[PDB]
Amino acid sequence: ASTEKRLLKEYRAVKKELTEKRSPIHDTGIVDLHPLEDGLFRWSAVIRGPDQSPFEDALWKLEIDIPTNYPLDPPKIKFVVFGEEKIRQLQRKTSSGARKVCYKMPHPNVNFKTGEICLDILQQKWSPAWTLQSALVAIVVLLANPEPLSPLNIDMANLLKCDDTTAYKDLVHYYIAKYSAY
Amino acid sequence: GQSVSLVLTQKDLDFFSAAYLNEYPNLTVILHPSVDKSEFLSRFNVQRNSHQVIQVRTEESIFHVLKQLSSNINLITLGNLEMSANEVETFHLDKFLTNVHEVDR
């Protein structure tokens, strides 16, 4: 019953926080966040990977599913990740409209295919104290701070176990170059 | 769309040509630790394709990079590694062939 008006409040909040230039929202990495359609229980978000990190200067898209008893239960959040054939068709519409977004996510704690994320905050260290907005900031922090010992992408994680930090970074720079679009 | 991962040691390097990177967008090159990335790029004038080239720092990393990339074709002379009998890692990879058969694709 109640959930609806929290979610609406969370939306208005972030709407108006992005409208201000000097607000701290921007250095958190959050470029955009809103509900789809008229339905409150499915949201889109765009984030910018954090500075001094291999994800710097690129955007990503996230889809957010909200359970009905939220905020008691966490949102399910995933990176939007497409197949190489779907991305190369999206690239054919090159008229440089809104923004470039990258549709692959190479990180130890995200699943390369599904876009699913392994982050304590989302898997039952969640509490109603958290908002959609701070969960996002949490995910950008995760991008700079992968956790190799809790991997959803073994191979990216193993580059860190090898201490092969340059391979990790080249590969991240690769995906961003080859697989972004509008 | 003709996806190939090419791993170049020092020795494999003479089978390379700047031509390959110009012509195939889905070619992706993985340098042995022995091969420095930035010297490789000026030596073949392939600065334009920096992103398609991946500097690795341990031999093990090669296999993780290959497995992460998952290219349709995987060219690598295992005989040119210093590691050996560590085929501990597997056939996750579609169509491995020794690097000598570049010219077939």
Q: How was this structure determined?
A: X-ray
Contact A60, A159 (CB under 8 A): no
Would strands A180-181 and A59-65 be described as parallel, antiparallel, or unpaired? unpaired
Contact A77, A122 (CB under 8 A): yes
Give me the DSSP letters along A106-142: --TTB-TTT-BB--TTTTTS--TT--HHHHHHHHHHH
Contact B5, B75 (CB under 8 A): yes
In angstroms, the CA A71 to CA A7 distance is 9
- Kindly determine whether residue B51 and residue A165, on different chains, have CB atoms separated by under 8 Å: no
What does the block give as tokens for B43? 């030596």
In angstroms, the CA B17 to CA B30 distance is 14
Residue A118 bears catalytic tag: yes
Contact B14, B83 (CB under 8 A): no
- CA–CA distances in Å: residue A106 to residues A73, A174, B49: 27, 10, 20
In angstroms, the CA A16 to CA A69 distance is 26
Specify the 3-state DSSP secondary structure of A30: strand
Phi and psi at A87, nearest 5°, equal: -70, -45
Contact B77, B99 (CB under 8 A): yes
- Pick from A115, A110, A121: nearest CA to A150: A110
Q: Looking at beta carbons, which pairs linking A167-173 to residues 24 or more positions away fall under 8 Å?
A: A167/B54, A167/B55, A167/B56, A167/B57, A167/B61, A167/B64, A167/B65, A168/A54, A169/A54, A170/B37, A170/B53, A170/B54, A170/B55, A171/A106, A171/B54, A171/B65, A171/B68, A171/B69, A172/A54, A172/A55, A172/A106, A172/A107, A173/A54, A173/B51
Contact A159, B65 (CB under 8 A): yes
Nearest-10 Cα torsion for B56, B60, B61, B62: 70
Domain extent for B30: 1-105
- CA–CA distances in Å: residue A87 to residues A54, A104, A147: 21, 9, 28
What does the block give as tokens for A77? 């959040």
What does the block give as tokens for B47? 């600065």
Contact B54, A170 (CB under 8 A): yes
- Pick from A82, A135, A144: nearest CA to A109: A144
- Pick from A27, A32, A171: nearest CA to B68: A171
Number of CB atoms found within 10 A of residue B65's CB: 26
In angstroms, the CA A150 to CA A47 distance is 22
Beta strands in chain B (DSSP E): 4-8, 27-31, 53-55, 73-75, 96-97
- Pick from A113, A111, A120: nearest CA to A83: A113
For chain A, the residues whose C-beta falls within 8 A of a C-beta of chain B are 84-85, 88, 106, 112, 153, 155-156, 158-159, 162-167, 170-171, 173-174, 176-178
Domain count, chain A: 1
Taking the CA of residue B24 and the nearest CA in chain A, the distance in Å comes to: 12
Residues of chain B contacting residue A159, judged by C-beta atoms under 8 Å apart: 61, 64-65
Domain extent for A67: 1-182
In angstroms, the CA A106 to CA A154 distance is 10
In angstroms, the CA B64 to CA A171 distance is 11
Domain count, chain B: 1
Taking the CA of residue A137 and the nearest CA in chain B, the distance in Å comes to: 26
Would strands A30-35 and B53-55 be described as parallel, antiparallel, or unpaired? unpaired
Number of CB atoms found within 10 A of residue A116's CB: 17
Give the resolution in Å: 2.8
CATH number for the domain spanning A53: value is 3.10.110.10
Cα A73 to its chain centre, rounded Å, is: 19
Residues of chain A contacting residue B58, judged by C-beta atoms under 8 Å apart: 162-164
| Chain B residue with Cα closest to A85 | B1
What does the block give as tokens for A72? 């008691």
Phi and psi at A97, nearest 5°, equal: -60, -115
- Kindly determine whether residue B61 and residue A84, on different chains, have CB atoms separated by under 8 Å: no
In terms of Cβ atoms closer than 10 Å to its own Cβ (0-12, 13-18, 19+), residue A97 is exposed
Cα A158 to its chain centre, rounded Å, is: 22
What does the block give as tokens for B70? 């998952």
Query: Which residue among A106, A164, A176 sits closest to B61, beta carbon to beta carbon?
Result: A164
In angstroms, the CA A127 to CA A75 distance is 11
